[PDB]
Design a protein around this ligand. Structure first.
Ligand SMILES: Cn1c(=O)cc(CP(=O)(O)O)c2cc(F)c(N3CCCC3)cc21
Ligand SMILES: Cn1c(=O)cc(CP(=O)(O)O)c2cc(F)c(N3CCCC3)cc21
Ligand SMILES: [Zn+2]
Ligand SMILES: [Zn+2]
Length: 229
C-alpha cells in the first residue's frame, strides 16, 4: 500500500505517521530514493526531512493539504545534504517554521542549501534542548554524535515503535557505509549504537534510501563501522 502523488510516494507506517519518498538520478546508480516522515499531531502536521528538491518538497505539502487538510506547524531536517535539506525554500515559501542542528545551519550555505530558520542545540546526553525545539509534541530529537556527517540528528515518534536515524543507519542487507566523504569514521560505530540506545523500544527503523527495517539495521551499521576504527 503505497500512495503516489505526482513524483512522490507516501506509505502509512502508523495511524499518525507516513513516510515520504522522493527520487533523484545519480550518475552510476539510476533513481535514488530518499525518505522522510510526516507526523499528524492532533490539529497539525510535522515534517521530518525535505525531498531532494523544492518542487518535490512542494508536492509533499500538496499531498498533506489534499489527504490530511491540516496545517504543517514545523519541519526538522536531519543533516545538511541535498536529500534531506534540498527543499528548505519550499517550506519557507509555505510559511512553515524550520529547524535543524545549529551545525547543519552553519554548513548549509557552502553546500548550496538554505539554512533552517531555527538552530537546535542538544543536552550533554544528546536529547534536544526543548527551548530550541518548542512545540515538537511527539517528535523526540536526539544527537547521537558524528557518523554519516558531523551534524546528523535522529528522531523517534512518541506513541509509536518508530525511530529514524536518517543516513547514519544503513539497512540490514547493506554492503557499504555509503558516503564517507563527510563522515567521522572514528566515532561512526558509537554514534550508530547511541541512536539505538536512545530509542531502545523502537522496532520499526525507517531507512534513508530503502524500506523500513528492523533494529538489525542499527546492529549491521555499527558492525561495519567497527571495522573502520
Ligand atoms: C555507494 N553508496 C551507497 O551505497 C549508499 C549511499 C547513501 P548513504 O549510505 O551515504 O546514506 C551513497 C551515498 C553517496 F554519496 C555515495 N557517493 C557520493 C560520491 C560517489 C559515491 C555513494 C553511496
Ligand atoms: C551518489 N550519491 C550522492 O552524491 C549523494 C547522496 C545523498 P547522501 O546519502 O550522502 O546524504 C546519495 C544517496 C544515496 F542513497 C545514493 N545511493 C544509494 C544506493 C546507490 C547509490 C547515492 C548518493
Ligand atoms: Zn547525507
Ligand atoms: Zn544517505
Amino acid at each position: 500500500g503505497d500512495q503516489r502523488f505526482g513524483d512522490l510516494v507516501f506509505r502509512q507506517l502508523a495511524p499518525n505517521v507516513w513516510q515520504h519518498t522522493s527520487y533523484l538520478d545519480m550518475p552510476g546508480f539510476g533513481a535514488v530514493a530518499s525518505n522522510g516522515l510526516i507526523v499528524r499531531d492532533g490539529g497539525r502536521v510535522l515534517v521530518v526531512d525535505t525531498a531532494w528538491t523544492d518542487d518535490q518538497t512542494a508536492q509533499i505539502l500538496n499531498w498533506i493539504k489534499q489527504e490530511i487538510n491540516l496545517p504543517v506547524a514545523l519541519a526538522v531536517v536531519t543533516h545538511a545534504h541535498q536529500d534531506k535539506m534540498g527543499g528548505m525554500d519550499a517550506l519557507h515559501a509555505a510559511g512553515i517554521a524550520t529547524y535543524a542542528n545549529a551545525l547543519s545551519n552553519q554548513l548549509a550555505p557552502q553546500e548550496g542549501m538554505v539554512a533552517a530558520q531555527h538552530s537546535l542545540t542538544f543536552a550533554a546526553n544528546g536529547w534536544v534542548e526543548p527551548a530550541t525545539a518548542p512545540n515538537f509534541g511527539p517528535l523526540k530529537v536526539f544527537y547521537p554524535g558524528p557518523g554519516h556527517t558531523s551534524d546528523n540528528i535522529t528522531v523517534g515518534i512518541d506513541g509509536t515503535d518508530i525511530a529514524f536515524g536518517g543516513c547514519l543507519i544503513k539497512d540490514s542487507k547493506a554492503k557499504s557505509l555509503g558516503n564517507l566523504g563527510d563522515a567521522d569514521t572514528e566515532h561512526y560505530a558509537a554514534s550508530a549504537r547511541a541512536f539505538g540506545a536512545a530509542f531502545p523500544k523502537a522496532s520499526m527503523i525507517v531507512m534513508s534510501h530503502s524500506a523500513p527495517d528492523s533494529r538489525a539495521a542499527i546492529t549491521h551499521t555499527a558492525r561495519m563501522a567497527d571495522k573502520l576504527r
